[PDB]
Amino acid sequence: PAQDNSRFVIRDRNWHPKALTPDYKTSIARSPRQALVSIPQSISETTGPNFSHLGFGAHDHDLLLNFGLPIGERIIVAGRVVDQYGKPVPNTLVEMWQANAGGRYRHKNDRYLAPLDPNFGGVGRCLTDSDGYYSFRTIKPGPYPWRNGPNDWRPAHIHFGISGPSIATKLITQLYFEGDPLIPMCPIVKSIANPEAVQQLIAKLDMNNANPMDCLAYRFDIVLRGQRKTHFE
């Protein structure tokens, strides 16, 4: 069973989006009003599932084939998961989901006019390797309108979930694409107060990881809470 030997760097809740960021409508009603109760870390928080043994399918991380070929900009999304100390987080689960090229999701609830792509599902999972790297192949999703403001459009984005070592590090985020003029305008994006934090969410065009004549690439690194051993406890 898991053991209590780690401690995690306390989250900087001023870096992360706050619960309540009104321009993002849904957050209004879905944000606690009471302060979070800080508790000391114990085994319960400092431990988490290890996904090492889950049976991944072969195309679990390849959206071009996991669902003909999808229509859209073929891209690879790759990066590394590290902790605050800059330490890699290996064998961690990275899951992602996104829309099609036209901004359409394969979910019943999506009725955007852009058609589904018979060949695209939009889900992927990948366990980070020993160095904390993950990679997916997909199509660049299109922006999509959403019912927030009257003319709100999500910048093209991919949703990400990352387990990390404990439940203390577990994170869900979204990746945005470098230069998307929609970024500075997104209320979701804007939930994050520090422009500096925003920058952390922008996947950079990575000509270096692209497949010439095939697909482009974007780099998205993820930093999880710093893990440290307990001392003088």
Partner 1 sequence: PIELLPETPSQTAGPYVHIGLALEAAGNPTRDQEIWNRLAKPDAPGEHILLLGQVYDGNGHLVRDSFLEVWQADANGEYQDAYNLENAFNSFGRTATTFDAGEWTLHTVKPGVVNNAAGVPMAPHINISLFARGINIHLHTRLYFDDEAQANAKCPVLNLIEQPQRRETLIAKRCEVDGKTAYRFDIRIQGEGETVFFDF
Binding mask 142-181 for partner 1 (x = CB under 8 A): ----xx-xx--------x-x-----xx-xxxxx---x--x
Let me know if 144 is a catalytic residue. Answer: yes
Is 105 marked within a binding site? yes
Tokens in use for 196? 């500096």
DSSP state string for 131-165: TSEEEEEEEPPPPEEESSSTTEEEPSEEEEEE--S
Which residue number, 210 or 223, has a Cβ lying nearer to a second copy?
Answer: 210
Which residue number, 101 or 192, has a Cβ lying nearer to partner 1?
Answer: 192
Using CA atoms, how far apart are residues 14 and 1, in angstroms rounded to an integer? 34
Let me know if 105 is a catalytic residue. Answer: yes
Let me know if 154 is a catalytic residue. Answer: yes
Tell the smallest beta-carbon distance from residue 202 to partner 1 (Å).
11
For 197, the 3-state DSSP assignment is helix
Tell the smallest beta-carbon distance from residue 77 to a second copy (Å).
12
Selecting among 24, 134, 144, 176, the annotated active-site residue is 144
Q: Which of 89, 123, 126, 139 lies at the binding interface for partner 1 (CB under 8 A)?
A: 123
- Of 100, 91, 93, nearest to 63 (Cα)? 100
Using CA atoms, how far apart are residues 27 and 19, in angstroms rounded to an integer? 7
Is 144 marked within a binding site? yes
Q: Which of 65, 73, 135, 200 lies at the binding interface for partner 1 (CB under 8 A)?
A: 200
Let me know if 107 is a catalytic residue. Answer: no
Where in the sequence numbering do the catalytic residues fall? 105, 144, 154, 157, 159
